[model samples]
Target: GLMQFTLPVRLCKEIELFHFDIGPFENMWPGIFVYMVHRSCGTSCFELEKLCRFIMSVKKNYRRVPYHNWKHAVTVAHCMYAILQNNHTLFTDLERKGLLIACLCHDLDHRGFSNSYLQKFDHPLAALYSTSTMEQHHFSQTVSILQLEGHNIFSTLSSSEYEQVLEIIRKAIIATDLALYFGNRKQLEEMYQTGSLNLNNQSHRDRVIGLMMTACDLCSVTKLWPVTKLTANDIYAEFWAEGDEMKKLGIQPIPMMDRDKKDEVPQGQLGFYNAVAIPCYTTLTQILPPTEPLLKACRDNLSQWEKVIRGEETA
Candidate 1:
């Protein structure tokens, strides 16, 4: 399916119209979980559905190639769903709903690469928005399509509910800014110092929600072998493609993950996974036990990546 086009527009349009009319799309597991969480937390039907619609639309903004697409969205949503199920008693439904909505839509419209593109090229996103404003803009777009457009998906909410919705959306969207990872880590540290993980204090919900979403984004290391193998390949290919693009533009690619064959031995999956993916996932599993099996899968995927890297497998 490489270089393949999506469904014909006529068919896509027909499907969209059918689903929009007949749904409350049940296939979007994250949306399903959000609805359940909203009900438990006292959010209205309209509020939950609005969030779902917004998230689903935002997911469309993700560029298909050179990488990061609905697959990543699905994966993140799945992780968040897992967390929600395991920690059902921790927070009100609204908080969890917002957290999950953020998890699902956080990276909508990302280019294959990271925020470095904005900085390297002096792109408008970096120039006008501090600490990576592109994603915040994406979040804004999601809100605009729902609220100003009077999509009415969110119209059923009370004012306080509306405010909480906005707050959750904002926090979750902003979490995609990898440039702020250090800041996020520090925030997590502060929360731990204050004994917030126990879910007893005021900051507890906020801290957990943010951390949980953030954790999912980087949790690939903990996934099962097959998923991790696939994910690692996807991530490396995208990174290499990005590096190639940057080279064409005369920009220096980020060093560690660069994959030009000329500068190194025949590039392969094992190197990238071992050098980059493993450490990250290992660290994640240390902090979250749910990730334990996923990381083992990552280890199992190691040989698969090696085979690919060693020219035993083709893309």
Candidate 2:
């Protein structure tokens, strides 16, 4: 969109190797994204320099929040990569490419707050869009970076290809809004129960991506105790921070948001497992058995949380 653009900063070769070897290094994920996308797509559909610059910028875009930072983005992207790698034949090349990039680019510029928080505060971002404020903002920031000079990763693609990929990326990012997960839950379950993949159907494909996106985003419940504990803590710290702020502003905080009720965190998490985690992975594993392990992990964690509730183990 502009004649002026800057070159992306060069990263060290050693860090790139470590990122690929061990997984998401903060300094090297841009390279990982660029490299992983090239390999996943079976070709470099985007310019390495452009994708590199864009992702590097994306790293800078995230705030140092408890969760929903670059750390969370990279983790979700890694999850997306794993999902695609094991099931490449399940999707078209464009689908693989879009899902990977969307997870990587989603949640850009997150303020460590919920979407409802923004709307509650009458924040500018809420005013910017009446609904899906944070999700829409994340997508906007993603495109904005890609439009920057030397940041146009799609430079190698023809107009049609770029449009198609961008559309997928857009829908995938928007699908992260948990509202959509609940929205699509019924239809997704019906399709799976009836055993009608109907991948050719546009809405079917859209909801499937939505389902996958939800799994990746809400994946902490599937992690082992340590990672899940830390992530849940991060969510609470972020939540309580906003809730406390809302209290200062004279807006009554909900029980979930009330830090004074910290004792309820355990039970709250228990309900989360029963209500959201189980049902989610149940359908996800149903649609893609390759992800059965993810469901297994969720159930294991569910059992662990139950133990904590019974005072048999510490959370």
Candidate 3:
């Protein structure tokens, strides 16, 4: 059978024309991305084979998981690039590196559902992580893998530097939790209201961590309309699958207007763009102009979905 989709890194390259034509960032981003990864992980590979193996392992391991996939990782990486490029004025070398590392590995090993879902299922993942009431098990899983004897990515960092990196990664990873959606929104709103657009001035590690995570989560909306539309569909599919699983487990599925049908993806996502993606990303573009196209894309996608639900085709 022919392939349905290209790999994540290739997708980033192929979709470049939708976002920008010049493509200056194409070459530059990978270089910086590698350096940031090395700085955070404390491992640099001299051979391309080793790097490819590691990346493939990361990609393959993630695909079997329900919600988290290489697509999510790539999206976050793209968002990180957009945020870094757009907010260059506000970020220094070290701070930018911190955000880059945190965003890339934030959800490295996510399970199908949200962190709370794991706890509710009486799964071993839930039991193993029962001690921590505050942090998400997904985040802890990333940290745990990093500490696995020979697999320790931060082996090269000194104790203090490694701890700092861990703290930054933890904060960003935790911020991805839906439970903190309001807190993240409030921070963005506050920054918008205060006129203190200082993503670069985030001295407190926690603030920097939170901003990085939000930046990644909200980054996809800044892509081209087609890409945003496709991504939205993928998200809806995940949600619909989750709803199906919930029903099978004797739990109430997440309510949606037409979830019983085969094509619930778009209709189920009406509020997703209007209330969530647009408002959030529009504010992001306010501090950075390059993000405007991505936000427009989100709005366009949502409008299309709204049209479909109304028994009309989105032209």
Top lDDT prediction, candidate number: 2
| Better candidate number, 1 or 3, judged by TM-score | 3
Where is model 1 poorest over a 10-residue stretch in terms of lDDT?
15-24
Query: Where does candidate 1 clash, by residue pair?
Result: 222-294, 222-295, 223-294, 225-297, 268-309
Q: Where is the poorest 10-residue window by lDDT in model 2?
A: 13-22
lDDT of 2: 0.78
* Candidate with maximal TM-score: 2
Cα-based TM-score, every candidate = 0.69, 0.89, 0.72
Tens digit per residue, CA lDDT, model 2, 245-285: 88977899887788998888888888888888789889888
Error of 1 at 23 (Å): 21
Lowest-sum lDDT 10-residue window in model 3: 15-24
Candidate lDDT values, in order: 0.58, 0.78, 0.56
Q: Please identify model 2 stretches exceeding 4 Å from their true place.
A: 1-25
- The predicted structure with the larger TM-score, 2 or 3, is 2
Reference-based TM-score, model 3: 0.72
